Amino acid sequence: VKTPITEAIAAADTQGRFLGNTELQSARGRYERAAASLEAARGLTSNAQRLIDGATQAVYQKFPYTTQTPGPQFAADSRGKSKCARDVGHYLRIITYSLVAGGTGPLDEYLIAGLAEINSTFDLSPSWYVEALKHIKANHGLSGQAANEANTYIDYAINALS
Amino acid sequence: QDAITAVINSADVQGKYLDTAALEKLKAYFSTGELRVRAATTISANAAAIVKEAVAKSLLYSDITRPGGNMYTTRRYAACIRDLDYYLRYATYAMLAGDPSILDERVLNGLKETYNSLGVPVGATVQAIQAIKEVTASLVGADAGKEMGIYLDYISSGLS
Amino acid sequence: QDAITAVINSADVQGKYLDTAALEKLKAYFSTGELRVRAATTISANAAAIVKEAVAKSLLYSDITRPGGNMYTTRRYAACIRDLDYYLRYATYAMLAGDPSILDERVLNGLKETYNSLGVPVGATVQAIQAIKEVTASLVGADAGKEMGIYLDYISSGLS
Amino acid sequence: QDAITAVINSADVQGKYLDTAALEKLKAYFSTGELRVRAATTISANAAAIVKEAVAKSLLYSDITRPGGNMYTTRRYAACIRDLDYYLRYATYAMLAGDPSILDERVLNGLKETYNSLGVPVGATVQAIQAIKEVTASLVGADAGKEMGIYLDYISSGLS
Amino acid sequence: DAITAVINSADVQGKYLDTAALEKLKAYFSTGELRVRAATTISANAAAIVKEAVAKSLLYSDITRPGGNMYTTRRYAACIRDLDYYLRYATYAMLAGDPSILDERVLNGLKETYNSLGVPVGATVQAIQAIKEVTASLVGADAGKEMGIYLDYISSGLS
Amino acid sequence: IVTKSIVNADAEARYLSPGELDRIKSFVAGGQQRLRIAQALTDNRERLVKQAGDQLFQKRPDVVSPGGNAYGQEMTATCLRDLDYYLRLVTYGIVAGDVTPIEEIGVIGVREMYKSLGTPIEAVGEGVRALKNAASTLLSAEDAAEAGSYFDYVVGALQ
Amino acid sequence: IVTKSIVNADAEARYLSPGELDRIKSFVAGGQQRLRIAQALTDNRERLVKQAGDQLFQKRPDVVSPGGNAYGQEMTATCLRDLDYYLRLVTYGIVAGDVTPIEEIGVIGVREMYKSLGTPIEAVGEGVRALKNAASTLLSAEDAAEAGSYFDYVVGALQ
Amino acid sequence: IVTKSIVNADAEARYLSPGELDRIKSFVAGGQQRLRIAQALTDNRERLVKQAGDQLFQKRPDVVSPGGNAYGQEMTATCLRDLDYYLRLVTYGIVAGDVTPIEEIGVIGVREMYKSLGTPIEAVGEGVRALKNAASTLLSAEDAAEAGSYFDYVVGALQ
Amino acid sequence: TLDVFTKVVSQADSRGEFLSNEQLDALANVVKEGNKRLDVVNRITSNASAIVTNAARALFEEQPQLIAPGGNAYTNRRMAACLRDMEIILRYVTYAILAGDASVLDDRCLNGLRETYQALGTPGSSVAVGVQKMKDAAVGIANDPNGITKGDCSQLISEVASYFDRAAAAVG
Amino acid sequence: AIKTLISAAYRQIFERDIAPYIAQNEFSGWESKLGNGEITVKEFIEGLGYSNLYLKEFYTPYPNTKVIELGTKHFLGRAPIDQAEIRKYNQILATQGI
Amino acid sequence: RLFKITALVPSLSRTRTQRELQNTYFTKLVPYENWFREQQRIQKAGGKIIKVELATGKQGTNAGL
Ligand SMILES: CCC1=C(C)/C(=C/C2=NC(=C\c3[nH]c(/C=C4\NC(=O)[C@H](C)[C@H]4CC)c(C)c3CCC(=O)O)/C(CCC(=O)O)=C2C)NC1=O
Ligand SMILES: CCC1=C(C)/C(=C/C2=NC(=C\c3[nH]c(/C=C4\NC(=O)[C@H](C)[C@H]4CC)c(C)c3CCC(=O)O)/C(CCC(=O)O)=C2C)NC1=O
Ligand SMILES: CCC1=C(C)/C(=C/C2=NC(=C\c3[nH]c(/C=C4\NC(=O)[C@H](C)[C@H]4CC)c(C)c3CCC(=O)O)/C(CCC(=O)O)=C2C)NC1=O
Ligand SMILES: CCC1=C(C)/C(=C/C2=NC(=C\c3[nH]c(/C=C4\NC(=O)[C@H](C)[C@H]4CC)c(C)c3CCC(=O)O)/C(CCC(=O)O)=C2C)NC1=O
Ligand SMILES: CCC1=C(C)/C(=C/C2=NC(=C\c3[nH]c(/C=C4\NC(=O)[C@H](C)[C@H]4CC)c(C)c3CCC(=O)O)/C(CCC(=O)O)=C2C)NC1=O
Ligand SMILES: CCC1=C(C)/C(=C/C2=NC(=C\c3[nH]c(/C=C4\NC(=O)[C@H](C)[C@H]4CC)c(C)c3CCC(=O)O)/C(CCC(=O)O)=C2C)NC1=O
Ligand SMILES: CCC1=C(C)/C(=C/C2=NC(=C\c3[nH]c(/C=C4\NC(=O)[C@H](C)[C@H]4CC)c(C)c3CCC(=O)O)/C(CCC(=O)O)=C2C)NC1=O
Ligand SMILES: CCC1=C(C)/C(=C/C2=NC(=C\c3[nH]c(/C=C4\NC(=O)[C@H](C)[C@H]4CC)c(C)c3CCC(=O)O)/C(CCC(=O)O)=C2C)NC1=O
Ligand SMILES: CCC1=C(C)/C(=C/C2=NC(=C\c3[nH]c(/C=C4\NC(=O)[C@H](C)[C@H]4CC)c(C)c3CCC(=O)O)/C(CCC(=O)O)=C2C)NC1=O
Ligand SMILES: CCC1=C(C)/C(=C/C2=NC(=C\c3[nH]c(/C=C4\NC(=O)[C@H](C)[C@H]4CC)c(C)c3CCC(=O)O)/C(CCC(=O)O)=C2C)NC1=O
C-alpha cells in the first residue's frame, strides 16, 4: 500500500541508508496537504447517501439499456439494482480512503489492481462506472482547494477504467 | 419571541440603549439568516418524508406498533404522526426565529402533563425526536443540522 | 388478608352468620392447603435458581444488558435481581394466603409510579415475570403452577 | 455531579470510549481548576461580608424591613441571612464542580413551592442574588466573577 | 498521627516547632513514600493474606475440630473478620506511623471481650504472628518490619 | 475527586477547607499525566484483553473446562468482553483520580450478579490481576504504579 | 419446637397458647417416628454420603477439576466430611423439629466462610440436594417427604 | 492529611484509596517547602504580630477606645497574645496540611468564648486578616498563596 | 509497511464503512503532530553514530566477557558485526518513529530475530541489555531543548521509549 | 435474634436490604459491638446515620426540606408536626452537619 | 472519645408489661459528643448513674482527640 510517508521509507530501505533530509521533506509535504484532504473527506461522508443514489440514477438516465434487457449482468431485476448500490457504494469508500491516506495507495490495491480482468469476465462495461464517477465529480458540492484534490482521485480511477 | 426581540427586550428592561454587544448579536443573526432561510425551505420541502423515515428508523417493527403498544390502534398511529409533525414544524419555527421561546410557549408548556395523562411513553418519543434530528441533520447538512438539532434536543430535554 | 379472613369479612359486613356457602369456601381452602404448603416449600427451596433461569430465558443477551439498556450498570443488574426476587416472594405469600390482597397492598400499590419515574421498561418486566411463571410452573408441577401463575399474572396485569 | 462526571456519563451512556472531544473537555477543566480553587478560597474568606454588603445594597432601608414587609420580624431577618448564605455557598460548590447539577439537586428542587407557600417575595430574592453576584464579582475579579455569576444567575433564573 | 503526636508534644511544652520536631517531620515524610507503596500492596491481597495465615496456623488443629472455639460456621466467619481487622488496623497504624489510634480502636475492649467469650488468647497471638510472616514475605524487608511493629503491638496488647 | 471533597464538606455546614483546595490544585496539576496514562491504556486495549485471557486461561483452566462457565466461543467472548468492561472502568478511574465512578459501575453490586450468573469471582480477580501485569509491562514505572493503583482497587474489590 | 414456642411466647407477655400446646402434643406424638428416621439415617451414614458426593461429582466436575477446590485425595476427603457434617445436622433437625440446631450450627455464617475458603456455594448446595435424593430413595415415602423437607431447608438456606 | 484520610476510610469499610495515597505522596513531596514556610513564620513572630495588631488598631479603633475591650497596656498585651496564638495555630496548620489542629485548638468553640469575654469577633477576624496580609508580604508569592489560604480558613471560620 | 494513516484505513476496511467525523478529528492530531514527529527522527539520525559508539561502551562496560578471549563478540570480524547490528536496530526504530506504528519494525527487525541467537550461539538476552541502554541516550538526546522553541513533545516521547521497549523485549 | 435485629434497622432506615448496595459491608465494627451488647440499639441507629452511605442515599440527591421529612420518617417514624419544628431542624442543618 | 457508661433509670410512668430490662439497667458505649445530652436525658429521667469510664480517649489531648 502506497503513502508518501511509506514512499520515503521504501526508497530509504532499498538504498540501505538512513532517513536523510531528502525523505523527511517528502513527509513534510503530505502534512501541509493533510489538513486540506480531510476537508474533502468530511465533504464526502456527509453526502454518502446523497451522492450514491444520485449517481446510480445518473447511470440509468444516460443508459436506459441496462434497466430493460433481461440478464444477470444488467440491473433489470431488483438484485441488480441492489448490487448497483454495492459497487458505487464501494467506489466512494475507497475514494474517501485515498483522501485520508494522502496517496493513491488504497485506491491502487482495493479497486484498480484487478479491475481490468473482472470486467472482461462479468460483462461489466467500464463505461458504466466511468460516467457514474463523473456525476460524483460534478455533484460533490465541495469548494476551495479540497474540491480540487477530491477531483484528483476521481479522475485517477477514470484513467484506470479507460 | 425572536433573537432580535430578545436582544431588544434585554436592552429595554435596563433602559439601556443599543450598545455594541447587542449590535454584535443582531449582526450575527443577520449573518446566519441566509442558511436559516435555506434550511427552513428544504425542511418545508419534505417534512412527510422526514417523519416517515423517522418512524421507520425508531418506532416501526417494535412492540409499540404491536397490540398492547401505544401505537397499535390506527387513530393512535395517526396521532403519533401528528405529534412528530408538530415537533418538526415547531423546531423549524424555533430555528428560523433563532430563539427557543416559542417551543417553551407553544409546545413544552403542558406536554408532560398530557403524556402522563394519556399513558404515552416518553422514552420512545425522545428516541423518535432523536431519529427526526438525525434524519434532518443528514438532509440539510451539518452546518444547519447543528441548529436544528439544538431545538430538537431542547424539545427532547424538556420532554424528559 | 386471607381467603379465610376474606370469607369472614364478607360474612361480617352483612351481619350474617357463617352460612353453608362460606363453610364450602373454607372447606375448599382446607382441602387445597396441602399442595399450597408443599408448593411454597419447594419454591422456597430454589428461588435463586428460578430467578437465574428467568433472566437467562428473557433478559440476558438482549440490548437491555448491553450499554444503553436499563440493566447495563451492575447496580442496576442487582436491582433487577432484587425486583424479581420480590415478585417471586410476594407471589409465594399470595399463593399460600389464597388471596391476592397482599399483592395489591404491598407490591402493586405505587409500582407503576416508580417504574415510570425511573424509566424502567415495563414490557421487559412483564416478560421477565412471565419467564418466572413458566419456570416455577415447570418446577412445581401443573396443579400448583396454575395457582402460582394466577398471582404472577396478577402482578403482570396490574403492572401493565 | 462534576464536569468530569458529566463527561464520563455522556461517554458512558453511548458505550463510547473517551474520544478526543471528551479529553478536550477534561483538559479545559484541568486548565480552569487553578482559578476555580483560588476563587473558592477567597469566597470562603469573607462570605459574611458579602451577605452583609448584599443586604445593605438591595434589601435594607426598604419597606421589606419595615413592618408589613417580609423581613420585619427578627427571626425572618435571620432566615433571610440564612437563605442568602445558602445561595452563596451552593454557588461556590457549583463553581468548583463546574457543573450546575448540584444547584438543581439541592437548592432549586422544591424552592418555588416553599417561597410561594410562605409568601416570600420572589423578585426581592432575585435582586438580592443579583447584589450578591455584583459584590462577589467585584471581590474575586472579572475572570472568576463570570463563572460565579453564571451559577448565581442560574439560581436567579430557576427561582423566577 | 506521628505529626499530631509531634504537635501535641510541642503543645504540652508550650513552644513552637523548631528544628528537632522539623527533623522528625522530615523523617516521617521520607518513610511515608514507602508506607504508601506498602499500603497499596497490602490492600491488593488482604484476603489472600488472611487465607494463608489461617491455613498456616489455625487449620487442622483442635480448635477447628468439634470441641473447639472455631468449630462452628459463625465462629469461623468471626475468626476471618477478626484477622481481617487486625490486618486493616495494622495498615492504618502503619500509615499513621503511630500505634495509639490502633490501641484506642481495638485494644480498648478486646481483652475483656475475648475473656468473656472464652476465646483463646495464644491462638490469636499465633495467628497474628502468621499474618506478620505473610505480610513480611509479601511486602518487603523494611516495610515488612514496619507492619510487624504494629502487629506485634496488637499481639502484645492482647496478651 | 472534586465530588468527594464537595460532598465531604457538604455533609458539614462548613465550606471547602483550603487543604482540600490544595489537594484539588494538585490533582489539577497531575491531570495531564493522568490523561496520557488513560490514552496509553485506551489505544492498546485488545492487546491487554488478549494477554489477560492468555494469563487467566493458563492460570485457571476450569473456565475452559466444560463444567465451568466460559465454555465455548460465545461464553469465552462474553468473558473477554467482561475483561474489556473492567479495563474501561479502570481508565475511567484513572481519569477521575478517585475510585468513585468505577466502583459505582463495576463494584457495588458485583458479588450477587456473579453469584446469580454462576461464575466464580476469584477468576475475575485473577483476570484483573493479569490486566494489571500486562499494563505494567506496557507502561513505564511511574505510570505502571499509578495504573496498578486502580487495578489493585478492582482486584481487592472483586475478592 | 419447644424452644421456639417458648421464645415466641417470651416476646409477648403471655403464656403458651392452646394452639402451641397442640403443636407440642402433635410433635410428641410424631417424635417416635422421627427417632425411627434418625435411626435409619444414622445407620446409613457411609453409603448415603458417598453416593451423594459421587452424584455431585457427576453433576459438577469443576470441583474435582485441577483448577477446582476439591482436587486431590485430602481435599475430596474434606469434601465428603463436609457432606457428613451436613447430614448430621439434618438428622439433628429431624429429631428436634426446629431448624435452630441446623441454623446455629451450620447455616448462619456459611456464606462468608465459603467465600473465604474459595469454595463455591452452589456445589455444596448441589451435594446436599444429592443427599436429599439419596435419603429420599432410602426411606419410606411420606417419611422421605419429612426428611427431604429439612434437607430442602438446608439446600435453600445454603444458596 | 493522614488523619483525615484514615478517618474518612474508617467511616467506610474499605482501605485507603489510590487517589488518597496519591494525596499523601504529594503532601510528602510538598512537606519540605511547608517546613521552609514554617521556618520563616517562626522566625518572623515578633514583627508580624506587631504589624498586624497595629494594622488592626488603624482599621478598628473601637477596641482601644476606652469603651472598648482592649483598653490599657495589659489588655492590649493580651490582644497581641491572642494574635500570637492564632499565628501559631496557622503555622501548625501549614505544617500538618489539615485544618484539624487549627480547628480543635482554636476554632471549634470560639464564638461562645468571645461572647462571654465581651470581645467582638469581627475585630479578631480583622486582626487575623492583617496577619494574612503581613505574612503574604513577607513570603514568596505562591508560597504566600499557601500561607494566606490557611489564614483565610481561620478568618472565615472566626466570623 | 503500514502507517497511522493506513492502519486506520485497514481498521475501517475490515469494518467496511466510511470514516466518521469523530474518527478524523483524532487523526487531525497527527497532521498537527507531524510538526513534532519530523524532527525527533531528525534529532536521532543526526546523532546516530554517537549513540551507537557510546552504547558500545555500555554493554562492554558491564559484561567484559564479550572481548574476553573465547567470547562471542570477541574477534574483529565479530566485533565489526556487533556495530553492524548496533545501528541496524536504529534505522528500524527511526522508521517506526516516522511511520508512527510499529508494523515496519515488526516485520523487518523483530520477525524471527530471536531465532538466530538460538542458531548462531550469540547471546540473545545480552542484546536486550544494550538496546535499552541506547534509549536513555536516545530519549536524552531527543528531549533536551537547544535552539528549538519550547513545546510539549512528552506525549510523543513516550512513543519513542515504547519502541525501544518493544524491540528489546522481543529479542531476549 | 441479634442477626435479625441487625437486618431490622437496615430495613427500617432503608426500605431494601443494604448489602446489595454497598461495596464493602462497613458495619463489621457496629455488628461486633451489637453482638457483644456493648452498645444499645439506639446508639446503633445513631451510628447508622453517621455513615456516608446514608448520606449518599438520602442526603446528597435531596434538598434540605426533603431531608427533614425523610429523616423524621426514618428515625422518628413520622412527619414533622409544626412549622417551628421544621425551623429548628433547618437551623441545625444550617449551622451544623447532618 | 468514647465513654463507657452504666446507669439505671426507673419507671415513674405506669408499669410496663414488657421488660425494658435493657432499658432500665444498661451499659453502653456513647461517643464524647452525644454523651452530654444523653447524660442530660438520664438526668431528666431521674435515674442513677453508677459508672462512667473513658473507654478510648486520653485526658489532656489538645489535638487529634
Ligand atoms: C471494494 C471495491 C469493489 C467493487 C466496486 C466491486 C464490484 C463488483 N461488481 C460485481 C458485479 C456486479 N456489478 C453490478 C453493478 C452494475 N451493473 C449494472 O448493471 C450497473 C450499470 C452497475 C452499477 C451502477 C451488478 C448488477 C453486478 C452483478 C452482475 C452479475 O452478477 O453478473 C462483481 C463480480 C461479482 C460480485 O462479487 O458481486 C465485482 C467484483 N468489487 C469490489 O471488490
Ligand atoms: C404542539 C405540541 C403538542 C403535542 C405533542 C400534542 C399531543 C397530543 N397527543 C395526543 C395523543 C397521542 N399522542 C400519541 C403519541 C405517541 N405515543 C407513542 O406511543 C409515541 C411514543 C408518541 C408518538 C411519537 C398517541 C399514540 C396518542 C393517542 C392516544 C389516543 O388518542 O387514544 C393528544 C390527545 C388528543 C389528540 O391527539 O388529538 C394530544 C393533545 N398536542 C400539542 O399541542
Ligand atoms: C415489593 C415490590 C417492589 C418493587 C418491584 C420495588 C422496585 C424498585 N426498583 C427500583 C430500581 C430498579 N429496578 C430495576 C428493574 C428493572 N429494570 C429493568 O430493566 C427490568 C425490566 C426490571 C428488572 C426485571 C432496575 C434496573 C433499577 C435500577 C435503577 C437505578 O437504581 O438506577 C427502585 C429504586 C430504588 C432501589 O432499588 O433500591 C425501587 C423502589 N420496590 C418495591 O417495594
Ligand atoms: C461494566 C459493568 C458490567 C459487568 C461487571 C457485567 C457482567 C456480566 N457478565 C455476564 C456474563 C458472563 N460473565 C462471564 C465471566 C467470566 N468468565 C469467567 O470464567 C470468569 C469467571 C469471568 C471473566 C474472566 C461468563 C462466562 C459469562 C456468560 C455466563 C452465561 O452466559 O451464563 C453478563 C450477562 C451477559 C451480558 O449481557 O453480557 C453480564 C451483564 N456487565 C456489565 O455491564
Ligand atoms: C458443621 C458445619 C461445618 C461445615 C460446613 C464446615 C466446613 C469446612 N470445610 C473446610 C474445607 C473444605 N471444604 C471443601 C468443600 C467442598 N468441595 C466443593 O467444591 C464442594 C462445594 C464442597 C463440598 C460440599 C473443600 C474442597 C475444602 C478444602 C479446602 C482447603 O483445604 O483449603 C474446612 C477447613 C478444614 C477443616 O477443618 O475440615 C471447614 C472447617 N465445618 C463445619 O464445622
Ligand atoms: C489558642 C486559642 C486561644 C485564644 C484565641 C485565646 C484567647 C483569650 N483571650 C483572652 C482575653 C482577651 N482577648 C482580647 C482580644 C481582643 N481584643 C480585641 O478587641 C480583638 C478583637 C481581640 C484581639 C484579637 C482582650 C482585649 C482580652 C482581655 C479581656 C479581659 O481581660 O477581660 C483570654 C483570657 C485571659 C488569658 O488567659 O489570656 C483568653 C484565654 N486563648 C486561647 O487559648
Ligand atoms: C521532515 C523535515 C522537517 C523537520 C525536521 C521539521 C521540524 C520542525 N520542528 C518545528 C517546530 C518545533 N519542534 C519542536 C520540538 C521539540 N521541542 C522541544 O523542546 C522538545 C524536546 C522537542 C520534541 C521532543 C518544537 C517545540 C517546535 C515548536 C514549533 C512547533 O510547534 O512546530 C518546525 C516548525 C517550523 C520551523 O521550525 O520552521 C519545524 C520546521 N520540519 C520539517 O519540515
Ligand atoms: C583478536 C584481535 C582483536 C584486536 C587487536 C581488537 C582490538 C580492539 N581494540 C578496541 C579498543 C581499544 N584499543 C585500544 C588500544 C589502543 N589505543 C590507544 O590509545 C593505543 C594507541 C592503542 C594500543 C597500543 C584502547 C585504549 C581501546 C579502548 C578505546 C575505547 O574504549 O574507546 C576495540 C573496540 C572495543 C573493545 O572491545 O575493547 C577492539 C574491537 N579486537 C580484536 O578482536
Ligand atoms: C474492629 C476491632 C474489633 C474486633 C477485633 C472485635 C472482635 C469481636 N470478636 C467477637 C467474637 C469471636 N471472636 C472469635 C475469635 C477467635 N477464635 C479463636 O479461636 C481465635 C483465637 C480467634 C480467631 C483468630 C470467635 C470464635 C468469636 C465468636 C464466639 C461465639 O460464638 O460467641 C465479638 C463478639 C460478637 C461477634 O463478632 O460475634 C467481637 C465484638 N470487635 C471489634 O470492634
Ligand atoms: C439550600 C436552599 C434552601 C433555601 C433557600 C431554603 C429556604 C427557606 N426559607 C424559609 C423561610 C424564610 N425565608 C425568608 C427569605 C426571604 N424573604 C424575603 O423577604 C427575602 C426576599 C428572602 C431573603 C433574601 C424569610 C424572611 C423567611 C421567614 C418566614 C418565617 O419563617 O416566618 C424556610 C422556612 C423554614 C426555615 O427557615 O427555617 C425555608 C425552608 N431551604 C433550603 O433548603
UniProtKB/Swiss-Prot annotation, chains B, C, D:
One short Pfam family name for this protein?
A: Phycobilisome
Name one cellular component (GO) term.
Answer: phycobilisome
State where (2R,3E)-phycocyanobilin binds: C80
Disulfide feature: none
Q: Which residues form the signal peptide?
A: none
Q: Name a biological process GO annotation.
A: photosynthesis
Q: How is it modified after translation?
A: Contains one covalently linked phycocyanobilin chromophore. The chromophore is added by phycocyanobilin lyase CpcS 1.
InterPro entries in UniProt? Allophycocyanin_b, Globin-like_sf, Phycobilisome_asu/bsu, Phycobilisome_asu/bsu_sf
Coiled-coil blocks: none
Q: Which residues carry this modification: N4-methylasparagine?
A: N70
Q: Which UniProt keywords apply?
A: Antenna complex, Bile pigment, Chromophore, Electron transport, Membrane, Methylation, Photosynthesis, Phycobilisome, Thylakoid, Transport
Where does the UniProt entry say this protein principally localizes? membrane
Please give the SUPFAM superfamilies that the UniProt record associates with this protein. Answer: Globin-like
Note the topology in the membrane: Peripheral membrane protein
Its annotated compartments are: Cellular thylakoid membrane
Function, please? Light-harvesting photosynthetic bile pigment-protein from the phycobiliprotein complex. Allophycocyanin has a maximum absorption at approximately 650 to 653 nanometers.
- Summarize subunit and interaction data from the UniProt record for this chain: Heterohexamer of two alpha chains, one alpha-B chain and three beta chains.
Concerning its family, UniProt says:
Belongs to the phycobiliprotein family.
What is this protein called in UniProt? Answer: Allophycocyanin subunit beta
Naturally occurring in which organism (per UniProt):
Nostoc sp. (strain PCC 7120 / SAG 25.82 / UTEX 2576)
Q: Which gene encodes it?
A: apcB
Swiss-Prot record, chains F, G, H:
Q: How does it get modified post-translation?
A: Contains one covalently linked phycocyanobilin chromophore. The chromophore is added by phycocyanobilin lyase CpcS 1.
Q: Which residues form a coiled coil?
A: none
Q: Which Pfam families does this entry report, sorted A to Z?
A: Phycobilisome
Transmembrane annotation, as ranges: none
- Protein residues bound to (2R,3E)-phycocyanobilin: C79
Compartments where located: Cellular thylakoid membrane
What's the protein's topology in the membrane? Peripheral membrane protein
The answer to keyword Chloroplast applying to this record is no
- Give an example GO biological process: photosynthesis
Main location (coarse class): membrane
Q: Does the keyword Electron transport apply?
A: yes
N4-methylasparagine occurs at N69
Q: How does it assemble?
A: Heterohexamer of two alpha chains, one alpha-B chain and three beta chains.
Q: Which PANTHER family match?
A: ALLOPHYCOCYANIN ALPHA CHAIN (PTHR34011:SF2), PHYCOBILISOME 32.1 KDA LINKER POLYPEPTIDE, PHYCOCYANIN-ASSOCIATED, ROD 2-RELATED (PTHR34011)
Which function does this protein serve? Light-harvesting photosynthetic bile pigment-protein from the phycobiliprotein complex. Allophycocyanin has a maximum absorption at approximately 650 to 653 nanometers.
Q: What is this protein called?
A: Allophycocyanin subunit alpha 1
Gene name, per UniProt, is: apcA1
Curated annotation (Swiss-Prot), chain I:
Source organism, top-level taxon: Bacteria
The modified positions for N4-methylasparagine read N72
* Annotated Pfam families: Phycobilisome
Is Ribonucleoprotein among the key words of this record? no
Can the keyword Electron transport be found in this entry's annotation?
yes
Post-translational modification comment from the UniProt entry: Contains two covalently linked bilin chromophores.
Q: Where in the cell is it found?
A: Cellular thylakoid membrane
| Gene Ontology CC entries for this record | phycobilisome; plasma membrane-derived thylakoid membrane
Return the InterPro entries for the record: Globin-like_sf, Phycobilisome_asu/bsu, Phycobilisome_asu/bsu_sf, Phycocyanin_b
**What is its membrane topology?**
Peripheral membrane protein
Its GO biological process terms? photosynthesis
Residues annotated to bind (2R,3E)-phycocyanobilin 2: C153
> Where, by residue number, does (2R,3E)-phycocyanobilin 1 bind?
C82
UniProt keywords, alphabetically: Antenna complex, Bile pigment, Chromophore, Electron transport, Membrane, Methylation, Photosynthesis, Phycobilisome, Thylakoid, Transport
- NCBIfam families assigned to the protein according to its UniProt record, in alphabetical order: phycocy_beta
Q: Quaternary structure per UniProt?
A: Heterodimer of an alpha and a beta subunit. Part of 2 PBS rod complexes, the conventional PBS rod and a photosystem I-specific CpcL-PBS rod.
- PANTHER family per record: C-PHYCOCYANIN BETA SUBUNIT (PTHR34011:SF7), PHYCOBILISOME 32.1 KDA LINKER POLYPEPTIDE, PHYCOCYANIN-ASSOCIATED, ROD 2-RELATED (PTHR34011)
What this protein is reported to do is described as:
Light-harvesting photosynthetic bile pigment-protein from the phycobiliprotein complex (phycobilisome, PBS). Phycocyanin is the major phycobiliprotein in the PBS rod.
Family from the record: Belongs to the phycobiliprotein family.
- State the protein's name: C-phycocyanin beta subunit
Origin organism is Nostoc sp. (strain PCC 7120 / SAG 25.82 / UTEX 2576)
Curated annotation (Swiss-Prot), chain J:
Where found in the cell? Cellular thylakoid membrane
Q: Which domain of life is it from?
A: Bacteria
- Residue spans making up a coiled coil are none
The family line of this record is: Belongs to the phycobilisome linker protein family.
Q: How does it assemble?
A: Heterodimer of ApcF (a variant beta-allophycocyanin). Phycobilisomes of this organism are composed of a two cylinder core, from which six rods radiate. The core is mainly composed of allophycocyanin alpha and beta chains and of minor components.
The protein's job, in short, is: This protein is postulated to act both as terminal energy acceptor (by its phycobilin-like domains) and as a linker polypeptide (by its repeats and arms) that stabilizes the phycobilisome core architecture. Has intrinsic bilin lyase activity.
| Official protein name in the record | Phycobiliprotein ApcE
Name its species: Nostoc sp. (strain PCC 7120 / SAG 25.82 / UTEX 2576)
Identify the gene encoding this protein.
apcE
Which residues of the entire protein appear here: the answer is 740 to 837 of 1132
